[PDB]
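Regression test attached.
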Amino acid sequence: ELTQDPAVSVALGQTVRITCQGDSLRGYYASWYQQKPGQAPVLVIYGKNNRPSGIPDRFSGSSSGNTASLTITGAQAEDEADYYCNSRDSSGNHPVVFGGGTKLTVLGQPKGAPSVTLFPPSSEELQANKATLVCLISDFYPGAVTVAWKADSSPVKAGVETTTPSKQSNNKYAASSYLSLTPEQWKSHRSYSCQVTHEGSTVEKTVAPT
Amino acid sequence: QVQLQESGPGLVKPSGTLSLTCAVSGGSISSSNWWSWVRQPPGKGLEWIGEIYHGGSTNYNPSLKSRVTISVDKSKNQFSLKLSSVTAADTAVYYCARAPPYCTSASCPDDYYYYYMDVWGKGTTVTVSGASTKGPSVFPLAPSSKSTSGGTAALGCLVKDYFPEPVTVSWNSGALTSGVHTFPAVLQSSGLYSLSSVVTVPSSSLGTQTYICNVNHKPSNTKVDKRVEPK
């Protein structure tokens, strides 16, 4: 139908070509769409090789026969995204067909240590007879992390919930971990800790009832 | 300068009918444009649903043709989508979009009327589930000395126990966007979601400026404006 590579890498400042191949491209002027996590698609190329006003000149397109291509010259960090090609089929009433998508990884971006903020349960939640510790983790790269919790200096695994990392707008990653307690557990302890392990190093934050 | 905004029900029961609206602003539906629908199942690619012209003509994806109806309303300046007999496969983000007049067939005298979608809505999340909808409990994440690091401080809002997705959060009714970070939700063991939203601010502004998080959970028609104050 309309096939493209699901995963393609390119180093910063270098050039990458993303190809789309299918019989519906013959005689057709393809269009291309960029999508970042948590956002709607954005048209980057239409009519084979035309750019909308807001799109940087390093984006360009071409096609011959059954194959179309999107080229990013000197790729920047903000080009990291999913790219979809688009055509209408030559049969029937010509329905719209999307390629399966290409995820563009841009290599050579700076690593980063996680930024960890730990909130105690709020006075309002405790008075609602619940208690949640909120450990917010941001600005780490690459996006692989593990989180452990401590009660005083003892491990606690009951009541832990932890998201998978998600890509931030600066291409770094974010995650969160919640510790559920009872109000009597929170107010009687000495402290609670969130330990965030990332690329061999660990950041631990501690809060106490006061 | 067309802008598009989706509006739909959030949750739809199995075998029920999905109903969505797209409000058109900065432009008129009574113009040469193909008002269109596209969807995106969680973690997957994009799928064209159909398009409509203001006179009434439509074209649909042949795999949805038997279940989809697209309609236009010139007086309200909006178009709409109905998807019947919904199942779990129909859980997705639904975008409305705009395509200029096009001519892609080989019988076209002109070949420069390319087909593309230049204007997109923000999307609306539809979930197909027999479970019931539940609105969120919102709690403040107050700033203090143990959330201040130098000239920077963190404060936020906890949004607990809601279903289905999504919840969107803004700050001061949109008058604060620098430093705002809404984290992706966690799917708890109970089947409910929770997320947090945090804003980093200069620590000299603590107590001298008002911070209010605006939590919206459209699937349960619930909004909560929560005042966040220092400990």
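Expected vs. actual: identical. The longest helix of chain A spans residues 183-188.
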